[PDB]
Structures are given as structure tokens and as C-alpha cells.
Amino acid sequence: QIDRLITGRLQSLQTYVTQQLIRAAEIRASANLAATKMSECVLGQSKRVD
Amino acid sequence: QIDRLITGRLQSLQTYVTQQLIRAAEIRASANLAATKMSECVLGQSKRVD
Amino acid sequence: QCVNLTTRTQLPPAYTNSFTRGVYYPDKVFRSSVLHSTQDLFLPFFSNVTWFHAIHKRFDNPVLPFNDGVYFASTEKSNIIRGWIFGTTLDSKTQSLLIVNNATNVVIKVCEFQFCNDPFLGVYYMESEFRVYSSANNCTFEYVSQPFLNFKNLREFVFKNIDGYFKIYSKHTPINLVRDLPQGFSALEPLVDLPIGINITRFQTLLALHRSGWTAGAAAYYVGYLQPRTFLLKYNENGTITDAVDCALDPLSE
Amino acid sequence: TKCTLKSFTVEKGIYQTSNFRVQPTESIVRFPNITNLCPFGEVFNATRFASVYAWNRKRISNCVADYSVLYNSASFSTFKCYGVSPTKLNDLCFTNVYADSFVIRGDEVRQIAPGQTGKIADYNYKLPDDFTGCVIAWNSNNLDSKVGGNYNYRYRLFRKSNLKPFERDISTEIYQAGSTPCNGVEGFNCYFPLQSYGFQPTNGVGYQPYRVVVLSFELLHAPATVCGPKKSTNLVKNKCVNFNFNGLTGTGVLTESNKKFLPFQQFGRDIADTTDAVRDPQTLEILDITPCSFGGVSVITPGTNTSNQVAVLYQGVNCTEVNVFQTRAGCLIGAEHVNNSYECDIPIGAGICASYQSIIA
Amino acid sequence: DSTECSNLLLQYGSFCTQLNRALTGIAVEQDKNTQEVFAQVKQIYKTPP
Amino acid sequence: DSTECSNLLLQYGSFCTQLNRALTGIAVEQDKNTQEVFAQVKQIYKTPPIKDFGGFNFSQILPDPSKPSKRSPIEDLLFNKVTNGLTVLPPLLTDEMIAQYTSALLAGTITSGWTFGAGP
Numbered sequence A, B: 001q002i003d004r005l006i007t008g009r010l011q012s013l014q015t016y017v018t019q020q021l022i023r024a025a026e027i028r029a030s031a032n033l034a035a036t037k038m039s040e041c042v043l044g045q046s047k048r049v050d
Numbered sequence C: 001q002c003v004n005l006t007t008r009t010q011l012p013p014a015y016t017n018s019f020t021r022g023v024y025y026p027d028k029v030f031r032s033s034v035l036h037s038t039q040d041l042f043l044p045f046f047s048n049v050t051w052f053h054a055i056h057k058r059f060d061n062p063v064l065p066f067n068d069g070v071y072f073a074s075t076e077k078s079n080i081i082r083g084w085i086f087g088t089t090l091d092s093k094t095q096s097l098l099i100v101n102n103a104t105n106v107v108i109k110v111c112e113f114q115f116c117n118d119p120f121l122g123v124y125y126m127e128s129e130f131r132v133y134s135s136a137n138n139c140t141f142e143y144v145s146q147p148f149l150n151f152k153n154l155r156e157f158v159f160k161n162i163d164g165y166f167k168i169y170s171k172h173t174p175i176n177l178v179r180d181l182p183q184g185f186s187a188l189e190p191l192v193d194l195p196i197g198i199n200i201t202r203f204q205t206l207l208a209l210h211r212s213g214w215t216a217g218a219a220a221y222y223v224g225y226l227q228p229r230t231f232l233l234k235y236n237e238n239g240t241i242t243d244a245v246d247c248a249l250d251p252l253s254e
Numbered sequence D: 001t002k003c004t005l006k007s008f009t010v011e012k013g014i015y016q017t018s019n020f021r022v023q024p025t026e027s028i029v030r031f032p033n034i035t036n037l038c039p040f041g042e043v044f045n046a047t048r049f050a051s052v053y054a055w056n057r058k059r060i061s062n063c064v065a066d067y068s069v070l071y072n073s074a075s076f077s078t079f080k081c082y083g084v085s086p087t088k089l090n091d092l093c094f095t096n097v098y099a100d101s102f103v104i105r106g107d108e109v110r111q112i113a114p115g116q117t118g119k120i121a122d123y124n125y126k127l128p129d130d131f132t133g134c135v136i137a138w139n140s141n142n143l144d145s146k147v148g149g150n151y152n153y154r155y156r157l158f159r160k161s162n163l164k165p166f167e168r169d170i171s172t173e174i175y176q177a178g179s180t181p182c183n184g185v186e187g188f189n190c191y192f193p194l195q196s197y198g199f200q201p202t203n204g205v206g207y208q209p210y211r212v213v214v215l216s217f218e219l220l221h222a223p224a225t226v227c228g229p230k231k232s233t234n235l236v237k238n239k240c241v242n243f244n245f246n247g248l249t250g251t252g253v254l255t256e257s258n259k260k261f262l263p264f265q266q267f268g269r270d271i272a273d274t275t276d277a278v279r280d281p282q283t284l285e286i287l288d289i290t291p292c293s294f295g296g297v298s299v300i301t302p303g304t305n306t307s308n309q310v311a312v313l314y315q316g317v318n319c320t321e322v323n324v325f326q327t328r329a330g331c332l333i334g335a336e337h338v339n340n341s342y343e344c345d346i347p348i349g350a351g352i353c354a355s356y357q358s359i360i361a
Numbered sequence E: 001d002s003t004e005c006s007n008l009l010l011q012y013g014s015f016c017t018q019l020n021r022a023l024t025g026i027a028v029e030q031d032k033n034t035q036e037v038f039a040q041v042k043q044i045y046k047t048p049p
Numbered sequence F: 001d002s003t004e005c006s007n008l009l010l011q012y013g014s015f016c017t018q019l020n021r022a023l024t025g026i027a028v029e030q031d032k033n034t035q036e037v038f039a040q041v042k043q044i045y046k047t048p049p050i051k052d053f054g055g056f057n058f059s060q061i062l063p064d065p066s067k068p069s070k071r072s073p074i075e076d077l078l079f080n081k082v083t084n085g086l087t088v089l090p091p092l093l094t095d096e097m098i099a100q101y102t103s104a105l106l107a108g109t110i111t112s113g114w115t116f117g118a119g120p
Ligand SMILES: *[C@@H]1O[C@H](CO)[C@@H](O[C@@H]2O[C@H](CO)[C@@H](O)[C@H](O)[C@H]2NC(C)=O)[C@H](O)[C@H]1NC(C)=O
Pocket: C002, C003, C004, C117, C118
């Protein structure tokens, strides 16, 4: 019974960590975009449209 | 018997959803690139090489 | 002792709207400022509840199937409704549960009773007439407790038979409406859980006669049936259920 | 840190190596008041006991039963159980108890047993082969015996067929010893079945009257109303203890609570369905259950080529619950806090950084 | 359509709700992607005849 | 705290180590993200005490000296509009230091143009 609970909770924890890694990749992409906008719009004048 | 079938089908569905999330992240990156090309190549003239 | 009541007036039973009544606390758990979704035997919102009258000449004491649970609503003045009759065959062949509130206390007994076909009490204008049973042979459980009890009082009851446990939920509400069920919200607190362990499939209300033949005092009560469904219950800061959502009523509440 | 990194050399940085736990110190079991005791005083110590052909059956139900007082009593000369254990009577729960009380002879005390064959077993009181419960018997020569002879206790001597288990027979039909017709009229070979005992104070051990109470247990689908006593301990607050409140167990710090429960409510839950509030069953007071201060143990070090000095970070742990400095990241032990500001070398968190120059934070 | 399977599947908790939420997020993300790429003008311009 | 559960959990190996290492990588990645976004200048610039910018008003974006958090009114409104083994590690940069970084960036782009992003 404890083995069933262990494999269920381990599957839940692996699912949480996997979706956290996917969201971390998305947030890293958004933060790389934000650093690019910080460099190009604040620290200079950008010719790039929109 | 249904416990074995349920854990097999749930593992298959979780694998499918994880692969779909990774491919959706890739397609989102491609679409952000395409929106950037739409802004900077169609709506303006770009000095960025290639 | 049994007496046939032969001065009744024939009338079909009535029906009315449940509104948002019949909600009870599903558990003994305090919850603070949270919305809790629970799956239990609940009374459906705005449902068709059976309406019985006692007026003069109406005297509604039939036997109804218990199903999975009973919601009992009572628009009561001068204490006509005194108890309920619980069992399966309501004779000495099986074992039956008796809930009575006489002039002193409430008595709960699980025995083999011989019920009359028309059981009632009676008040002479002083209660001096008890004709609800003729025998009591084999008792297994006795429990004496504190008494639970224009229409001035509203009495809601929920009876459930789950795993040999008899749950009685109740709420007292002061109302001043004349005829029908008032529209509002009142969650029923758990009063007492009974270790009865018996089969119950049929039930019957117990009334009281008024003697001065017989006269039926003005009373009205309502029977609703509990169905397995989901409620989204709202718990306030003080931990009382102030509002509920029936998840299978309409797509908005879904 | 070398054990965690599986290397003998540690690069400069902060490394989460272990997990600080506030270990539970005491066990607190609070169980409600032991009231509504089972009426064993009117069964074992009644005024007059019954005969064995008409043994009195008392139903013990809807009460809590203290078998330790019955078991620790030294007056009982026989305490033999056949389906349960005597030391586990206070732990197990049963639906109901049947108490069969009678008086027999001292030589017939062994005859109340499964598989035992005797006159009392065949004609007066029979136990099944799968009997559960305990048989209790004690000498009653000072009470039942009379100097003129106590003839009030009768017993059945003859019957055509043996008893079924837990079967009574109070009939007074005249037995047929021979094959002669008897219409209830006694004759040469027709005798009355119930005979009186010869209980006298001049009799030795074996003929003295013994009072026997037999407890039988039922384990049907009815709820287990009969349970053993609950030994509740004292309540200890403001410490990381193991709490057991009315079958709800856990580990936490039990502090006073400002949450006013409604009187029908016993436990309290937050949004995430974890029990954070509870009511003590002994005294109706509300207690908050704060989880013990678990934390991550991080080791802040420079390179082992540089130095062997380390600092320890207990994450989210106050410094009074573990060169001691309190940060918003946690308690940092082994680093000297300075008022100067430098560039971040080893990140601690919440604006705190560590560097080596000794280890400063 | 097996109700015993769903009764056993409810013992595993909210895995199915998580998977449906992830697929719903992907499904609305595709429409967001098309909206971001192609709907960069609020005026429908027309060429001269 | 069940020791039998941990004895059975040791049969599955180093799954817990992988989960902890993945979460640690995410946790340091968040601080790296904040470091790449906000810490683009190594000089903390300040505006002059006299706000004579030829009619241009920056009071809604410059830090308010009356507030203890040293935030701009816009940043204060932005911060007002956002509302079992589990631990939350605090971020390495506090909100005060991120506000200080944005104040330095605002002072640089107001007083010095784009010159501070390419040199002195
Ligand atoms: C009250 O009326 C009921 C119904 O007519 C009576 O119950 C019947 O009594 C007769 C008496 O011989 C029986 O043969 C029937 O089988 C009974 N019917 C049922 C459904 O049980 C009842 O006896 C009447 N009460 C009195 C006091 O006469």
C-alpha cells in the first residue's frame, strides 16, 4: 500500500517538476526578450519596427 | 486489471501531453520569430543582415 | 390500541419549490474563507418537493419510500409534528426505529414494534392519548436525549443511512411567512449520529390530534429526497456556509 | 558537501547538502472523557445469580468497557479466553457482548469450554467450537452456601439430545429413562429432569458453588459500540510534538488559536485541505497546528584549494530554532556580518551575499 | 464508457484535469500565435482598382 | 516522517536528487533572468535635485522621496495591482534593489542619453 502511495506521489512530483521546467523555459524566453528590450529600447534608440 | 490498464494509458497520455507542450513551445518560438519578421520586414525596412 | 380516522377529505398531494434549501454541513471540519466542492447526498436546488397539509379536514400521514435520504421541512406552530416512523416493513417481522418527542423528552428506540395502520398522538383541551403502537418485543438500542424542538418556526431535517450510521442534521429558523417555503439560505448543523445498523426503506410522519371526534391543528410539512450530486459551498470568515452552487442545475452554476 | 558532490574537491559556491528537521520531542494523545461505563457491577456482583438451565443473558452494548478492572481483580479463580487475548480486551472493539451468568459445581467449572463434554455442557450450557470471548469464574462459598443446604440452584440432568450452542431449555418435561410410556407421570423409570445441588459449607473444594460469567463477543456488520478505555495524556503546547486527537494524528507545533469554531466542528482546514486547526476533546479549546520548522541545509564555502572554512545556511529557519546572523533567506551560522557592501561572490538570497577575505556576509 | 474505470481513475486525483488544462492552454496558444502573426493592423487596406 | 516509507523509497534510487537538482536549476535560472534584465549598468546614476528638463516631467516615473519603498508612483501602482516539504526561496535581488536598478537606468537615460549604455 505504501508502494502504491509512493509511486503515485512520485508521479505527481515528476509531473510538477516537468511542467515547472517547461514554464521555466517559457519565462527564460520572456526574460531574454525583456533583456533585449532593456538593451535596445532603454539604452538606445531602435530602428526595429514595433 | 483496470489498474494496470489505467496506469499504462495514463503514462501514455502524460507522455503525449509532455511532447505536445515541448512542440507547442517550439511553435510559439517560431511564431514569435514570424511576428518579428512581419513587423520588421513587411512593416518596415530592416538593417539587420540576413 | 389503533383507531381508524374516517373523517378525512380526499385531496391529491401538492408540490412546491425547494429554492436553495436542504443544504447541510457535509463534515465536522471548520473551513475559513474558502470555497469547498463536495460530493455527497444533497437535495437538488429548485426541486419538486412533496407538500402535505394538516388543516380543517386534512390529515396527511402516509407511508413513503425512504430512497437514499429524506429532507424534512416543517412549517410548525403549537408543536403538532412530534416524530417519525422508520423501518422497512413496519411490522413485527422486521426491526424498526422509533423517534418520538412527547411532552417530556425525546426517546429513540430500535425494536420490533407492531405499528398501527394509522398512528397518531392526541392532545385534549393536555396530552393524554398515545396510539402509535400495539407491541414491542425485541429491543436492541435505546437512547434518551434532549428535545430537538401564522407559522412561526421552521424545522429542517436531513436523515441519512450510511454504513449503519443514522445522521440527523437540523436547523431552526424563525420565519413569518404564511403558506409556502421561504426563499433563503440556511445550512443544517449536524445534531446526532446514531449507531442503528438497520435497514430502512420506508418512513412515516407522526402527528398529534386535537380533541375538544377529532380536529387537526393547522400544520404543513414538506418531504424532499437526497440525491448524489456536487455542491460548491461557500465558507465565510466565521466558518458558516452562507451560499451554495448546485453544479448540475444549469450551465452557469456548472 | 564532499559527500553530497561525490568529490574530494569543492568549488567555491553554496551547496544544498541536507534537510534540517525539527525532530518531534513528545507524543500528545488527547481522547475525550471516559463516561457512560458498561454496567459490569450489576452482572458480576448482582444480588442473586441465576441457575444454569435458565442462565441470565445480559447484553452489553452502547458503552465503553473497562476490562482492566475485571482482569486485575484477584477474586476470580478462573480467567480463560478462547477466541481473544486478555491483555488485548482493552484495545479491541466489538459490536455487542453477551454476558451469561450462572452457578455450577466446582468440578464442573472446566465443563464451560469448547470441545468439553459433560452434563452441564450437554444439557445446561453449551459453547461452540469456534467460541470467542472469555469465561470468568470465582468461588462463592461465603455467599451462596447455606448451613441448611442451598437447594435453590437447579440443573438439568437428563435430555434426549445434546444442546446447540447458546441454547436455553427451561422445560420441565419428565424424562423417559426406559421405554415405558410416561404422560408426565413419574414412575419407576421416569424422573424429573431438574435436580438441586448439594452446596454446603462442610463440602470440600470441588463441591462449593462457583459463580460463572461468560462473555461472548459478536463481530457482525453492526457498528462497534463496545470499545476499550482510552488513556489520554496531558496536553503540551508550543512544542513540535506528535499529536493524536480523536484518531487524527500528525506532527506539529500546537499553539493557541483565535479561530472561533462553531460547536459542531472539531478540525480546521485551510485552502489546501491540510489540518491547521483542531479542537482538544478534553477541554473544548481551539488550537492552531503550525508545521515544525523544516529547512534546507546549505553549505557556503570557498574552494578547498583556498580554504576549508565553511558557513551553514538553514533556509527559512529562525536563528532561535536551530557568528550567528539572521537573514530573510534563513539563519546563517559561521559568517561574520559586516556593514560594508561588496560585489556578490556567493549568493545567499534576499540581498545577502558571502565572500572570503574568514567568511563574511 | 466504463464507469468502474472512472471510479478507479478518480483515486489518482486531478491528473486528467491537469492534462486537459495543458491541452487547453496549447489550443488557445495556437490562436494567440495566429493573432500575433497576422493581425498586426486594425485597418483593412485595399489596393486601387 | 515515516521511516518505512523512506526505506521503500530508497529502492527507487536517485529520483529525488534529480527533482531537487532540476528545481535548483530553475531557482538559479530565475535569479540569472533578473540579473540579465535589470543589472545592465554597473554605475548607479542619480538625477539632479533640480528637475529642469525643458518642460519634461518625469515625476510619475522617477522615485518618490516621500515613500519609504523609494518607488515611482507608476511602480507603486504596479506593485499594488499584483496580488509538506515545500519551501519558497527568496529572490536574490529584493524589490528595493530592482527599483534602485530601474532608478539608475532612468537617471542614465534622462541625464546622459544613450551614452551611458555604450560607455561613460
Ligand atoms: C384501520 O384500517 C386498516 C385498513 O383497513 C385496518 O387494517 C386491516 O385490518 C383487517 C382486520 O381484519 C385485516 O384483515 C387487514 O389485512 C388489515 N389491512 C392491512 C393493510 O394491514 C386496521 O385493522 C384498522 N384498525 C382498526 C383498529 O380496526
